[PDB]
Amino acid sequence: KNRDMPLDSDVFRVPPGYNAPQQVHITQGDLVGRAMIISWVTMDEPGSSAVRYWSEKNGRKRIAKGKMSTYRFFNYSSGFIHHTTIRKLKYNTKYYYEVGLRNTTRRFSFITPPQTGLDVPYTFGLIGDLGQSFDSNTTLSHYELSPKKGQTVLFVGDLSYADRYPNHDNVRWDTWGRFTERSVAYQPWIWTAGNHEIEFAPEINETEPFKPFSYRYHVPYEASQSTSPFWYSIKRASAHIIVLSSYSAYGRGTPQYTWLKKELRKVKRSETPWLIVLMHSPLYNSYNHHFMEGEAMRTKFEAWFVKYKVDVVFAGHVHAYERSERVSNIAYKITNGLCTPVKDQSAPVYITIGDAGNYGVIDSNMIQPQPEYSAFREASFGHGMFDIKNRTHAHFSWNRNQDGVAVEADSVWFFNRHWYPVDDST
Amino acid sequence: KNRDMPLDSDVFRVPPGYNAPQQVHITQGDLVGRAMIISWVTMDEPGSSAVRYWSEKNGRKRIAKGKMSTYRFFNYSSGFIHHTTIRKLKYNTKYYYEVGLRNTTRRFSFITPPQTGLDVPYTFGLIGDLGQSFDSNTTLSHYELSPKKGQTVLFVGDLSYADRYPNHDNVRWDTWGRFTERSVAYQPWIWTAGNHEIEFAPEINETEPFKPFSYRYHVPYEASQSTSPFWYSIKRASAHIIVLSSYSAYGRGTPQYTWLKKELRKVKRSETPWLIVLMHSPLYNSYNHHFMEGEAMRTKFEAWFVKYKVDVVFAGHVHAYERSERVSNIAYKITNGLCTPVKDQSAPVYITIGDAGNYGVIDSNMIQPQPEYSAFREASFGHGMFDIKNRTHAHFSWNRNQDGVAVEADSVWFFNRHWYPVDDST
Ligand SMILES: *[C@@H]1O[C@H](CO)[C@@H](O[C@@H]2O[C@H](CO)[C@@H](O)[C@H](O)[C@H]2NC(C)=O)[C@H](O[C@@H]2O[C@@H](C)[C@@H](O)[C@@H](O)[C@@H]2O)[C@H]1NC(C)=O
Ligand SMILES: *[C@@H]1O[C@H](CO)[C@@H](O[C@@H]2O[C@H](CO)[C@@H](O)[C@H](O)[C@H]2NC(C)=O)[C@H](O[C@@H]2O[C@@H](C)[C@@H](O)[C@@H](O)[C@@H]2O)[C@H]1NC(C)=O
Ligand SMILES: *[C@@H]1O[C@H](CO)[C@@H](O[C@@H]2O[C@H](CO)[C@@H](O)[C@H](O)[C@H]2NC(C)=O)[C@H](O[C@@H]2O[C@@H](C)[C@@H](O)[C@@H](O)[C@@H]2O)[C@H]1NC(C)=O
Ligand SMILES: *[C@@H]1O[C@H](CO)[C@@H](O[C@@H]2O[C@H](CO)[C@@H](O)[C@H](O)[C@H]2NC(C)=O)[C@H](O[C@@H]2O[C@@H](C)[C@@H](O)[C@@H](O)[C@@H]2O)[C@H]1NC(C)=O
Ligand SMILES: *[C@@H]1O[C@H](CO)[C@@H](O[C@@H]2O[C@H](CO)[C@@H](O)[C@H](O)[C@H]2NC(C)=O)[C@H](O[C@@H]2O[C@@H](C)[C@@H](O)[C@@H](O)[C@@H]2O)[C@H]1NC(C)=O
Ligand SMILES: *[C@@H]1O[C@H](CO)[C@@H](O)[C@H](O)[C@H]1NC(C)=O
Ligand SMILES: *[C@@H]1O[C@H](CO)[C@@H](O)[C@H](O)[C@H]1NC(C)=O
Ligand SMILES: *[C@@H]1O[C@H](CO)[C@@H](O)[C@H](O)[C@H]1NC(C)=O
Ligand SMILES: CC1(C)Cc2cccc(CO)c2O1
Ligand SMILES: CC1(C)Cc2cccc(CO)c2O1
Ligand SMILES: [Fe+3]
Ligand SMILES: [Fe+3]
Numbered sequence: 108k109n110r111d112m113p114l115d116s117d118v119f120r121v122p123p124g125y126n127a128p129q130q131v132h133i134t135q136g137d138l139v140g141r142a143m144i145i146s147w148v149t150m151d152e153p154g155s156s157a158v159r160y161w162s163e164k165n166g167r168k169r170i171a172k173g174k175m176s177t178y179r180f181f182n183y184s185s186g187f188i189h190h191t192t193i194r195k196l197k198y199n200t201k202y203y204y205e206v207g208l209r210n211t212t213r214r215f216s217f218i219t220p221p222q223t224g225l226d227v228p229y230t231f232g233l234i235g236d237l238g239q240s241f242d243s244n245t246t247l248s249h250y251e252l253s254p255k256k257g258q259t260v261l262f263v264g265d266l267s268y269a270d271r272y273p274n275h276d277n278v279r280w281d282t283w284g285r286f287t288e289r290s291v292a293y294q295p296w297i298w299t300a301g302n303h304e305i306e307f308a309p310e311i312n313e314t315e316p317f318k319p320f321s322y323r324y325h326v327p328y329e330a331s332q333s334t335s336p337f338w339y340s341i342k343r344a345s346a347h348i349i350v351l352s353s354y355s356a357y358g359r360g361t362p363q364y365t366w367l368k369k370e371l372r373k374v375k376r377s378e379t380p381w382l383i384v385l386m387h388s389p390l391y392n393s394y395n396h397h398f399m400e401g402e403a404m405r406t407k408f409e410a411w412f413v414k415y416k417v418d419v420v421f422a423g424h425v426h427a428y429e430r431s432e433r434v435s436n437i438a439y440k441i442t443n444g445l446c447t448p449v450k451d452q453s454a455p456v457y458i459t460i461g462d463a464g465n466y467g468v469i470d471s472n473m474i475q476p477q478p479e480y481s482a483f484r485e486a487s488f489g490h491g492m493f494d495i496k497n498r499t500h501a502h503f504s505w506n507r508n509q510d511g512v513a514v515e516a517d518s519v520w521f522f523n524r525h526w527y528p529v530d531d532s533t
Numbered sequence: 534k535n536r537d538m539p540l541d542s543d544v545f546r547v548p549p550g551y552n553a554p555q556q557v558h559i560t561q562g563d564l565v566g567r568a569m570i571i572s573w574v575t576m577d578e579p580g581s582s583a584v585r586y587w588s589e590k591n592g593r594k595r596i597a598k599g600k601m602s603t604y605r606f607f608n609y610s611s612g613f614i615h616h617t618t619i620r621k622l623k624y625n626t627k628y629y630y631e632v633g634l635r636n637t638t639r640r641f642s643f644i645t646p647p648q649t650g651l652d653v654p655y656t657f658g659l660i661g662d663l664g665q666s667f668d669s670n671t672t673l674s675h676y677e678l679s680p681k682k683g684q685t686v687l688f689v690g691d692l693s694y695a696d697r698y699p700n701h702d703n704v705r706w707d708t709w710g711r712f713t714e715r716s717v718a719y720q721p722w723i724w725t726a727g728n729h730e731i732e733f734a735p736e737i738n739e740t741e742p743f744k745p746f747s748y749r750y751h752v753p754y755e756a757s758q759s760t761s762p763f764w765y766s767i768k769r770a771s772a773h774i775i776v777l778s779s780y781s782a783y784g785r786g787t788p789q790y791t792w793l794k795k796e797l798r799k800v801k802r803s804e805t806p807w808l809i810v811l812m813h814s815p816l817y818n819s820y821n822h823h824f825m826e827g828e829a830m831r832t833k834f835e836a837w838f839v840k841y842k843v844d845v846v847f848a849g850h851v852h853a854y855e856r857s858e859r860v861s862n863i864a865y866k867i868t869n870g871l872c873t874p875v876k877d878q879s880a881p882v883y884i885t886i887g888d889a890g891n892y893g894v895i896d897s898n899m900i901q902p903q904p905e906y907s908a909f910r911e912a913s914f915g916h917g918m919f920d921i922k923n924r925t926h927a928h929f930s931w932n933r934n935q936d937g938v939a940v941e942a943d944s945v946w947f948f949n950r951h952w953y954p955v956d957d958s959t
């Protein structure tokens with residue numbers, strides 16, 4: 108069918124005034140929380156890439172300077188894209204920032220996270236495969252109305268679904284920018300790259316993977332000694348978050364592979380006890396759709412995730428909700444017969460959470476019966492929250508769109524794999 | 534325990550004359566064999582990129598123009614690299630070609646293949662992980678001294694092993710170019726990217742993978758609508774050869790995955806009976822060294838190879854020889870326990886032929902006992918020959934450096950999977 112919100116929808120409205128900055132969004136700008144990448148688009152002319160900013164406390168108004176860029180895609184011309192990095196911020200404080208300093212100015216605000224620490228509580232939103240359908244709008248609306256009150260969104264891939272349109276009509280990137288602004292202009296969303304961001308379209312001489320995405324959404328990849336925007340890590344509060352790319356190389360000797368192997372070695376559980384991995388394609392998935400796609404990355408990375416006692420791996424891709432048991436399937440040796448996943452308290456829980464809305468379609472077909480390794484699964488739209496209480500406890504909840512904003516359809520306690528490695532099995 | 538040929542070795546002699554072209558190599562330059570890429574380096578000055586060439590049939594001298602490029606790697610500065618494509622060649626005819634038209638000219642010849650066809654015989658050589666050890670030299674001589682007479686080399690990756698040197702001393706790329714000249718200047722070598730081509734070294738601000746390889750060795754990739762030099766196909770005689778990149782992305786939706794999926798659809802067994810796939814890392818391997826590394830790509834591609842009746846898949850990486858049975862391992866679904874390879878007449882034979890010499894170390898450790906899927910494996914240096922008699926028969930043989938050039942240690946008839954799918958089991 109067609110359940111994408113019409114161009115003239117209220118979520119798509121353009122901020123008024125000559126060259127008013129639009130599609131504003133922010134994300135963590137450094138490795139630990141002291142910086143922030145502020146981004147936006149101006150449509151009438153290049154404009155300034157300057158950000159004004161100040162804490163509500165100490166009232167000194169500083170000015171950050173950034174860069175402007177443009178891109179083309181087939182018959183589409185981007186507007187003027189700005190990214191600026193505000194650095195040396197104070198932990199745990201509200202900051203006001205402004206963009207569009209030369210003409211129409213707009214003001215926004217954000218709150219830096221506490222300094223990383225073993226016992227720092229923090230609430231992450233979890234959203235995958237958002238799209239811009241009516242379902243999409245409902246999810247975002249639930250998240251912002253959650254009483255748990257999310258401070259950062261971990262976003263597991265597939266943003267605008269703009270590549271489903273005629274010529275990947277990139278206007279549909281612009282709309283998704285203006286739609287998400289009401290959330291991401293005030294809190295970082297941590298970006299993962301999904302298959303709808305590949306935009307590989309040889310048929311119209313666009314053969315550079317990830318182009319529109321890579322122009323519109325910067326991440327702090329050098330911060331973690333990565334050579335690419337598609338894999339990086341950041342530390343925020345008590346969490347160490349590794350972000351991977353289901354669609355870049357991960358063979359032995361590749362950049363991503365090499366970077367990951369080192370990065371894990373840099374994880375200090377006494378400083379960030381919550382080790383979280385993000386990636387678009389799930390490695391454990393009992394839905395028919397995309398079943399076993401994640402098998403290739405699993406052969407390369409699963410054993411590591413276990414060696415390093417990862418707490419949780421979030422994925423999207425599959426348009427539905429799943430939560431694995433703590434299992435591993437890493438004893439296989441071709442001829443040894445050992446290919447069944449087994450209970451394993453060192454392994455992460457795997458969560459598919461790619462049901463935020465996409466283009467309005469849910470994946471309902473499941474392998475039957477439910478496999479031993481699947482703890483819970485349901486084909487409903489929604490988003491999740493991973494809520495860190497302390498060094499031993501994180502409460503994860505899944506909320507459905509058909510339910511009330513306070514209802515938790517599925518809800519489990521995560522016991523830390525380093526500080527409290529006990530059967531949290533449901 | 535350093536077995537590389539010294540810099541003052543004869544095989545590394547510099548051709549004489551001011552700005553004499555060196556490191557001359559050719560490779561197919563179009564899809565079906567009517568074009569040829571001539572490559573060389575000049576050291577003294579840029580020089581001309583023109584190539585003079587005539588056929589023996591017509592004795593009409595013609596000029597083709599190409600491009601010159603250069604690169605740097607850390608503190609290394611390349612010479613002047615030339616790539617020129619000759620086009621509109623006539624099938625099955627002898628050409629002479631000349632390079633270095635301004636100062637020192639040098640003359641070489643090649644022979645276009647026959648026009649592609651169902652019953653067109655052709656002898657392909659197989660070489661992998663060649664290197665520049667004394668072992669490397671022996672393999673190359675056995676190859677050129679072969680009664681079988683290879684007409685084209687299918688080269689499964691790992692060229693110079695320059696990257697084993699301090700800062701990857703790219704000088705050892707130059708020496709390798711000069712050393713292989715006595716073969717590749719007179720017959721094409723088809724190039725596969727190996728792990729020693731990756732040359733990802735962020736420690737010295739060299740982070741563009743395949744850089745040196747990319748500049749020195751061009752391939753006719755746009756010819757098969759690939760968008761990258763690391764995966765592509767050519768048609769030569771009665772074979773359709775597909776080259777893949779073990780160290781590029783092959784995830785679902787990525788360029789290589791997309792290209793391969795479409796390319797297999799394009800194969801016409803009625804034009805090119807013998808379907809051959811080259812990659813660096815083996816899908817089946819029963820040796821310790823690199824055991825199971827090919828698992829990831831296998832999970833993505835194996836079923837396609839079975840589905841399209843691939844006749845043979847060649848690889849290297851493992852420094853030995855191995856030949857599998859026709860097997861598949863494509864029934865696994867995580868929980869059905871079906872993870873054992875089975876005889877499968879519809880599947881390719883998998884050959885590991887990465888034993889041309891490298892830097893002089895053979896991989897002798899094998900997993901015992903020999904798996905059912907493994908038909909033959911020996912830890913000796915040498916090369917292979919894939920000799921196509923016609924649409925039904927091809928004869929594969931393996932020559933050992935320790936044997937006479939005319940002796941075959943392993944020998945086996947392939948019965949075409951599309952035209953003559955009789956059990957060709959040994
Ligand atoms: C967008 O911001 C610009 C910078 O503030 C405005 O222009 C500047 O206005 C100053 C005082 O009006 C004047 O000294 C400058 O010449 C002028 N422009 C530049 C290039 O700095 C601009 O205002 C409009 O454009 C300028 C050239 C004038 O003609 C005004 O009359 C226009 O309103 C702002 N643009 C708009 C459309 O608001
Ligand atoms: C980390 O946070 C957990 C959730 O807030 C704490 O658990 C809870 O402790 C309450 C009293 O503090 C108790 O009434 C609740 O039943 C319990 N909730 C759960 C899900 O267990 C936890 O507190 C510690 O660990 C628990 C299991 C008890 O032994 C408490 O006495 C401990 O203080 C917090 N752990 C730490 C290290 O602070
Ligand atoms: C590129 O850098 C290398 C070191 O990072 C140069 O080699 C080093 O030179 C040192 C003093 O010049 C010498 O004592 C070291 O043994 C050596 N380091 C290594 C690991 O080889 C290299 O140099 C040239 O060749 C070397 C062997 C010497 O003959 C030097 O005199 C030469 O400059 C550098 N290459 C270039 C093109 O600059
Ligand atoms: C490389 O070839 C060039 C011609 O293709 C030479 O330049 C030429 O040398 C001829 C000497 O026999 C001279 O008459 C021509 O004028 C000249 N053609 C040009 C300049 O394009 C070149 O010779 C060297 O450089 C020239 C400019 C003079 O300086 C000569 O004395 C040099 O030999 C050849 N290079 C070398 C180093 O042999
Ligand atoms: C295609 O090439 C095959 C390999 O050369 C041919 O088989 C060979 O045929 C020879 C006589 O032509 C015979 O003496 C060889 O022993 C035989 N070699 C093998 C390995 O079988 C094949 O020839 C056809 O089929 C064979 C089996 C014979 O029965 C002949 O009658 C046929 O020529 C070639 N196919 C064709 C159709 O030519
Ligand atoms: C691009 O092409 C489509 C038809 O292919 C057309 O309808 C659309 O208006 C064009 N967009 C622009 C901005 O040129
Ligand atoms: C999206 O949700 C917002 C907030 O709940 C609402 O005000 C708006 O009308 C919705 N937009 C559409 C097109 O559904
Ligand atoms: C390499 O082999 C060739 C041919 O066998 C021979 O002419 C030459 O002596 C050898 N050179 C070295 C360095 O082994
Ligand atoms: C099957 C593909 C090409 C992959 C994929 C992942 C997530 C969502 C969609 C729907 O187009 C999708 O289409
Ligand atoms: C273990 C590694 C670094 C991998 C690899 C691939 C191909 C050749 C070699 C050399 O031993 C090699 O050593
Ligand atoms: Fe999706
Ligand atoms: Fe090798």
Ligand SMILES: [Zn+2]
Nearest residue numbers: 265301302424
């Ligand atoms: Zn997806």
Ligand SMILES: [Zn+2]
Nearest residue numbers: 691727728850
């Ligand atoms: Zn290798």
